[PDB]
Design a protein around this ligand. Structure first.
Ligand code: NI
Length: 161
């Protein structure tokens, strides 16, 4: 066992069936720092945990989620599974929000130890409220066991309903 592994979070679907949240990723323009054909954005949005985005470039690997309008965001969900991805499994992630690429501010820094499922990241501001922002940037700063490229199998973003 790996006693200090990151506990798996709740299945986002359970959250959705409560009718209290709305997934709003479809409202954003998504871009990636790098990818491999057939292993990119679509594979982070297809509701399929068997497919994945695989980067092909220098760290940090970035997922940019940009809205046209100021948008209220409450929770970011990322699926990562160490048993399946080994060195492609992120180990250090920075979540940043802001008006644009040049005014981003880190709001959460996550250390992941052999994750096995969904990672829930609250996106609240300095007043504990859901942030309202134009952009979210997810940065993979390092992967497990000297991994150059990363894998993520799904990403969801929820706004309060
Ligand atoms: Ni053990």
């Amino acid at each position: 066992a790996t006693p200090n592994k990151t506990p798996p979070g709740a299945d986002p679907k359970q959250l959705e069936r409560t009718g209290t949240v709305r997934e709003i990723g479809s409202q954003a323009v998504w871009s990636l720092s790098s990818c491999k054909p057939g292993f990119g954005v679509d594979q982070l949005r297809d509701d399929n945990l068997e497919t994945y985005w695989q980067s092909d470039g220098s760290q940090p690997h970035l997922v940019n989620i940009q809205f046209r309008r100021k948008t209220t965001v409450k929770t970011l969900c990322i699926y990562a599974d160490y048993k399946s991805d080994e060195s492609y499994t992120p180990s250090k992630i920075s979540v940043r929000v802001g008006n644009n690429f040049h005014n981003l501010q880190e709001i959460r820094q996550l250390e992941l130890v052999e994750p096995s499922g969904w990672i829930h990241v609250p996106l609240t501001d300095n007043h504990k409220k859901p942030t309202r922002t134009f952009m979210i940037q997810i940065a993979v700063l390092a992967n497990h066991q000297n991994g150059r490229d990363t894998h993520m199998r799904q990403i969801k973003i929820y706004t309060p309903v």
